[PDB]
Amino acid sequence: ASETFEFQAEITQLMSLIINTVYSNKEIFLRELISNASDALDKIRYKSLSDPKQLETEPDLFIRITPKPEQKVLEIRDSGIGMTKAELINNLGTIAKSGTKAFMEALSAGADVSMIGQFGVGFYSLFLVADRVQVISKSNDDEQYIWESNAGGSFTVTLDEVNERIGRGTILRLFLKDDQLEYLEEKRIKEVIKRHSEFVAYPIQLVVTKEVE
Amino acid sequence: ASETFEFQAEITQLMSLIINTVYSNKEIFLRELISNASDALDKIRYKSLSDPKQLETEPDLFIRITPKPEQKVLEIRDSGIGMTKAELINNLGTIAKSGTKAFMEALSAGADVSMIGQFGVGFYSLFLVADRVQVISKSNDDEQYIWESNAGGSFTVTLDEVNERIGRGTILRLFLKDDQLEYLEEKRIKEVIKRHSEFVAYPIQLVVTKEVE
Ligand SMILES: COC1=C2C[C@@H](C)C[C@H](OC)[C@H](O)[C@H](C)/C=C(\C)[C@@H](OC(N)=O)[C@@H](OC)/C=C/C=C(/C)C(=O)NC(=C(C)C1=O)C2=O
Ligand SMILES: COC1=C2C[C@@H](C)C[C@H](OC)[C@H](O)[C@H](C)/C=C(\C)[C@@H](OC(N)=O)[C@@H](OC)/C=C/C=C(/C)C(=O)NC(=C(C)C1=O)C2=O
């Protein structure tokens, strides 16, 4: 089933920094994850200009937020390009990232966490509000895989026999911290999107569950 | 992966009858599926009176409707007792049912389809509005399985490596007919529940997806 990999050292260090910070504007994590989703929709949409059959696995291009209050979990879905087993491994931890040290140096010098995205390491901002992540992803070029981290020194990557089938793309499964359940609520989610994600080319769907009156 | 089984002969016959009928009150299929859900919630709730650890796999007791417009699919979820591989096989087709012939005889004599549930064969009413069903189920006593039918002479039962994990219970996955997509819409669903499912002990949740304004 399930392989384990080592985080490059500064990535550990940065995650540890973020997860431990008192910062007062953690809502930016959603700006980042939405903007990553958009970057991945862009990428597949562009790819299919020269290869239209790439869109076939999943014709609709969207971003979808799903609060799961009962599980203390928030999910950000996209029908973007997705990632293969080897891209999860390389790009999410094992290799040194061009901005990690520079950002941490900026941070300790006074910089706002908000700036994370400009150092190209804004995926790690999710730890502002979550102590476990699953990245579940299906690329047109591979089977569906689950990448998991708890901010420790290592992560796991497992063949997905367990979750619904993504036609194509990626789900970010955030297990929220108990002092961050504000991000489970419709009003809150809507506000953060309004404020920080006005200029997004793709529909952003919110999946909401109400008991029938 | 995937075994195939034979429908007992009258069950085929009845399915063929239902799927082919012009009947003007097909909405009753939802009454039936909700009431089955309730029968399965009852059953686990009762079981755990003498065995409280049975509720642990899924503490919440609910029924959940999820329209999937993009897929022409409606899902009815319950956290009831669920079914094992052997119960799917026995109880959903292979063995002769006590009411099948009697109901078909009632039908051709004038009876309203609405009466199906009183012959204890109301599960088959789903074919009024669907030409494919998946029954995905997880019983505390077995792995999660998928039972599939297209109203033909046979059905399949496959180990589930493909759908999200039910802690416990059952999802009815209806693939609706093109002239029955009315059941994908919030207003419609709500109306049918109001009319036919007033007296239900369990919360009925409706999962709705709206694009953010
Ligand atoms: C230029 O692409 C980006 C990179 C470089 C690569 C990891 C890009 C990645 O390699 C397989 C892919 O092209 C996809 C599109 C990655 C994402 C943008 C994100 O995945 C999502 N959300 O589906 C996203 O993963 C959930 C990417 C995470 C990568 C990191 C660490 C991130 O913070 N910054 C990057 C962003 C925001 C990028 O847009 C980045 O490295
Ligand atoms: C008395 O239980 C019932 C039976 C007899 C058995 C199949 C019961 C079944 O055996 C494994 C289970 O006790 C569960 C609780 C079955 C359901 C009620 C239904 O499953 C759902 N919705 O989770 C439901 O399956 C999705 C049961 C389908 C069974 C048939 C054919 C049905 O139309 N009628 C029955 C109903 C409505 C029952 O309530 C029935 O046979």
* Residue of A64, A207, A212 with shortest CB distance to B190: A212
CB B207 within 8 A of CB A209: yes
- The alpha carbon of residue A103 and the mean position of all alpha carbons in its chain are separated, in whole angstroms, by 19
- Pocket flag, ligand 2, residue B93 (CB < 6 Å): no
CA dist., res. A137 & res. A153, Å (int): 22
User: What technique determined this structure?
Assistant: X-ray
DSSP A90: I
Cβ neighbours, 10 Å, residue B164: 12
Q: How far is B208 from chain A (nearest CA, A)?
A: 5
DSSP B185: S
CATH number at residue B46: 3.30.565.10
- Chain B neighbours among A 68-127 (CB < 8 Å)? 70
Q: How far is B10 from chain A (nearest CA, A)?
A: 35
Tokens linked to B161: 């490596």
Q: Which amino acid is at A44?
A: I
Maximum distance among all Cα pairs of chain A, rounded to whole angstroms: 53
CB B192 within 8 A of CB B31: yes
Contacts of B45 (CB under 8 A, 6+ apart): B55, B61
The SS3 of residue A101 is helix
Q: State how many domains chain A has.
A: 1
Resolution of the PDB structure in angstroms: 2.7
Tokens linked to A160: 């997905």
Beta strand A154-159 with B73-78 is unpaired
Tokens linked to A44: 């597949």
Ligand 2: centre distance to CA A178 (Å) = 39
Give the residue from A35, A29, A34 showing the smallest Cα distance to A64.
A34
Tokens linked to B123: 């599960």
Give the residue from B124, B121, B123 showing the smallest Cα distance to B99.
B121
CA dist., res. A48 & res. A33, Å (int): 23
Q: Quickly list DSSP for chain B.
A: -EEEEEPPHHHHHHHHHHHT---S-TTHHHHHHHHHHHHHHHHHHHHTTS-GGGGTT-----EEEEEEGGGTEEEEEE-S----HHHHHIIIIISPPTTHHHHHHHHHTT--GGGGGGGT-GGGGGGGTEEEEEEEEE-TTS--EEEEE-SSSEEEEEE-SSSPPPSSEEEEEEEE-GGGGGGGSHHHHHHHHHHH-SS-SS-EEEEEEEE--
CA dist., res. B9 & res. B1, Å (int): 26
Nearest CA in chain B to A60: B70
Residue with CA nearest ligand 1 atom 4: A120
CB B180 within 8 A of CB B26: yes
Give the residue from B8, B36, B12, B3 showing the smallest Cα distance to B172.
B36
CA dist., res. B157 & res. B178, Å (int): 26
DSSP B27: T
Tokens linked to B117: 């549930």
Structural domain for A209, as ranges: 1-213
Give the residue from A197, A164, A166 showing the smallest Cα distance to A82.
A166
Give the H/E segment covering residue B14: helix B9-19
